[PDB]
Design a protein around this ligand. Structure first.
Ligand SMILES: Nc1ncnc2c1ncn2[C@@H]1O[C@H](COP(=O)(O)OP(=O)(O)NP(=O)(O)O)[C@@H](O)[C@H]1O
Ligand SMILES: Nc1ncnc2c1ncn2[C@@H]1O[C@H](COP(=O)(O)OP(=O)(O)NP(=O)(O)O)[C@@H](O)[C@H]1O
Ligand SMILES: [Mg+2]
Ligand SMILES: [Mg+2]
Lengths: 242, 242
């Protein structure tokens, strides 16, 4: 019933315990925003959610399937969780269209015509249908990140992870990437977004999770955490950024 | 006697002819710079060399292998031709190190220990040994492009293709990238470089090809084509990049 469930998740990289046991339970259709200083383990957490990194202690069950359960097919899981990174979301050697159908064809064995019918719909939905036969290098940062999203949505995931999707964009390119995301939030997509775009969080986020030094130090509805933070660390952090 | 041999090379997309027949003969250890306005067919040309695109008429023989030859094995030409793009040169879900070892292991079938060796070297060779375990999102454009080179070098290519490797970099970061390319040239690497960074060409380019609308309008040593261009078009292009 809970789309994403994490119990005392712990993760260490050598002599450094990056995650020190965190608890996260995200309901289906819930949009969760994660914030916090560099090195607080935000990326590591996301990488564990879509089986890109392995964890030490605690357990992660997404959509009711324990990632450590002996039977569970780790690929069905990966297939249902999509991810958009800060950069490097596309293959520069193929067209926008081909970037999008690559996985649906290889992983889902969809015939080309089917994959493309689906790819063009998505592309048309982020306003870049006319970029189908272009290469990534010809796209602005704003168009590329939209293509990146369309590409992840092509696998029709149940979950969508975003690791600083607009962070590396020129300020004017931010808006277009954020509106596509809010629409995703509007259609009930379960979402976890690592971002420091306040506006997006206030208007679309259900909860904000403040991470600092391996722990989720505070959480709450966006309004409450931003305007009336209860923990001294949240305050210090907030005052230093945005 | 010939690393790259291209004859009457013609490429068309639908009813539009992008490469109207070009002839290029590059010898091992040579460095050719390609310049020209948007749509000249520069990228299409590089892609034809790296088996990333197929072609209509004419012929192409890499390191003595005719790509249209029924016999000859293409995918061994692929391993021999490296290529750095303007952007998206890295996998975001992987560590730098892993970005570099991936292909060697997967393609050449190298053992992990071996691959990771070749990787750490190329890394230190580009000034990024301390970042072998970091993720791409943490690299600056310049660092990212350098890792990109290491990643293509790991495969031990006989040829290196560059498509505007510094075009999307802030001015401060172009320098560090051109440098790695300069070294590669001095080490006798057959190179084809699409770049509007005129200095680099004059500094290590044996020849410069000015491309305009499907044809190679003019060419010659850097100093010549740049200081005294014979064609009105070359003269006109250079003026806008003055
Ligand atoms: N192989 C590794 N993978 C991920 N993290 C690592 C690794 N090795 C060391 N670390 C450390 O793990 C800690 C947390 O990393 P991370 O999850 O990327 O923090 P972060 O919040 O995403 N940083 P930023 O992305 O700058 O906010 C950092 O100190 C990393 O240096
Ligand atoms: N499917 C396709 N793949 C690649 N190119 C295509 C395709 N369809 C049409 N084209 C056209 O191929 C022509 C040449 O492109 P290209 O080789 O990238 O020129 P260019 O010099 O690299 N452009 P720029 O990189 O802006 O200088 C362009 O007009 C493209 O629109
Ligand atoms: Mg991060
Ligand atoms: Mg190009």
């Amino acid at each position: 019933l809970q789309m994403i469930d994490v119990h005392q998740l712990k993760k260490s990289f050598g002599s450094l315990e990056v995650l020190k046991g965190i608890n996260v339970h995200i309901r289906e259709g819930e949009v969760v925003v994660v914030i916090g200083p560099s090195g607080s383990g935000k990326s590591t957490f996301l990488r564990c959610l879509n089986l890109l990194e392995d964890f030490d202690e605690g357990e992660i069950i997404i959509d009711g399937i324990n990632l450590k359960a002996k039977d569970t097919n780790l690929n069905k899981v990966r297939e249902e969780v999509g991810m958009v990174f800060q950069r490097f979301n596309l293959f520069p050697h193929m067209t926008v269209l081909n970037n999008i159908t690559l996985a649906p064809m290889k992983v889902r064995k969809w015939p080309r015509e089917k994959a493309e019918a689906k790819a063009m719909e998505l592309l048309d939905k982020v306003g870049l249908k006319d970029k189908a036969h272009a290469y990534p290098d010809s796209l602005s940062g704003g168009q590329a990140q939209r293509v990146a999203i369309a590409r992840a949505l092509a696998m029709e995931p149940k979950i969508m992870l975003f690791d600083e999707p607009t962070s590396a964009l020129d300020p004017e390119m931010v808006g277009e990437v954020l509106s596509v995301m809010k629409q995703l939030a509007n259609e009930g997509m379960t979402m976890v977004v690592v971002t420091h775009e306040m506006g997006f969080a206030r208007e679309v986020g259900d909860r904000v999770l403040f991470m600092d030094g391996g722990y989720i130090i505070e959480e709450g509805k966006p309004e409450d955490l931003f305007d009336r933070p209860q923990h001294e660390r949240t305050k210090a952090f907030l005052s230093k950024v945005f």
